[PDB]
From a paper:
The asymmetric unit contained four molecules and seems to contain two distinct dimers. We then performed small-angle X-ray scattering (SAXS) experiment to further confirm the dimeric conformation of Cg2612 in solution, and the result indicates that Cg2612 functions as a dimer as observed in other LOGs. The central β-sheet which is formed by seven parallel β-strands is surrounded by eight α-helices. Dimerization of two polypeptides constitutes a pocket which serves as the active site, and the conserved “PGGXGTXXE” motif was found in the surface of the pocket, which will be described in detail later. In our current structure, one phosphate and one glycerol molecule are bound at the AMP binding site and these molecules mimic the stabilization of the phosphate moiety and the ribose ring, respectively.
[name] produces active cytokinins via dephosphoribosylation, directly hydrolyzing the bond between N6-substituted bases and ribose 5′-monophosphates in cytokinin precursors such as iPRMP or trans-zeatin riboside 5′-monophosphate (tZRMP). Based on biochemical studies and structural comparison with other LOGs, we propose that Cg2612 functions as an [name]. On the other hand, EcCadA showed no phosphoribohydrolase activity with AMP as a substrate.
Residue numbers in the entry:
A (entry chain B): 3 to 197
B (entry chain A): 9 to 191
The structure:
């Protein structure tokens, strides 16, 4: 229906190819995967087998959900792709990879990661602002990991480079049930009233 | 050597005229070095400011813009050359091909997005070009603080974070770019 948000069938997850320095990030990813599958949401992600990327894909498969990785030729030649995925799309470059992860997902989540995770997050958020998609964008704030980013965006907003209304449409939860609940009920803000 | 530099900067002007001025001063400094501008082709915000400044100072400015943004009345019509491309990704492929290095002046989410793409791709060996942050009025300090924590939590190689250029003065910035070596 026209008044309804599309219902989330898949979520695209951005996260590190390292595990990072707390056991907690491995736990927290596992929990989200379980919650996701509980609501019949499947996973789209970058197709890796190590670090949090690997953790989250494995947790998804193990809870009995599905998992669609999208990976490049370069990465597949260097034999870095996960081998037991529901599907694994191999594409010529990093652009197409991001484009395809964004077409496949019904929403985006950023779990802890580094530069690459930021590359992906800001792109999809920018695109939301340009009207290229109207899918929700969320930060999984595991042990406050994303708090420094929020301080940075708050400062950018104050200096006038980001509209407060966009920044406030960013979902940030540390609880996974909350996170996905906000993603399901999310609607984009009316262009009619931005300020 | 550095002949063209790709600049990422905000589509708005920001709440203080300091940014406009720094953007102007940087363009002059780069023209004096013989360096031309490559950027996303807009006339609004600091994009417009920096492109005007390169032109008015005797230098050249090349824009790469999508068909959509052109249609949106955001394009600059008095550049040295303006390429029109299908989409955002071809636009970044081209800005990266044309650039010999990358500078991120103040901006928002659009700027962040371009910045992180080319930084990440430096980490992966896709290119070996300097990436620099023009730290006007400490604008990028909160970003460095975020990166510092990510490095302390295991998600960014310290080695790589240290190869990131950060400078508030434009003569220092361009010299840092000119003498930089890869990680």
């Amino acid at each position: 229906s026209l008044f309804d948000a599309p219902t989330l069938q898949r979520v695209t997850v951005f996260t590190g190819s390292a595990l990072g320095s707390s056991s907690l990030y491995t736990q927290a990813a596992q929990t989200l995967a379980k919650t996701a599958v509980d609501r019949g949401i499947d996973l789209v992600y970058g197709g890796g087998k190590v670090g949090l990327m690997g953790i989250v894909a494995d947790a998804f498969l193990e809870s009995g959900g599905e998992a669609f990785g999208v990976i490049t030729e370069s990465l597949m030649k260097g034999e870095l792709g996960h081998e037991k995925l529901t599907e694994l799309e191999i594409v010529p470059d990093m652009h197409i990879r991001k484009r395809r992860m964004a077409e496949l997902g019904d929403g985006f989540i950023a779990m802890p990661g580094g530069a690459g995770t930021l590359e992906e997050l800001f792109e999809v958020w920018t695109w939301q602002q340009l009207g290229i998609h109207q899918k929700p964008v969320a930060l999984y704030d595991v042990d406050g990991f994303w708090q420094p980013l929020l301080e940075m965006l708050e400062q950018m907003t104050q200096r006038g480079f980001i509209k407060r209304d966009f920044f406030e449409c960013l979902i940030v939860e540390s609880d996974p049930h909350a996170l996905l609940k906000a993603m399901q009920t999310w609607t984009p803000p009316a262009p009619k009233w931005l300020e």
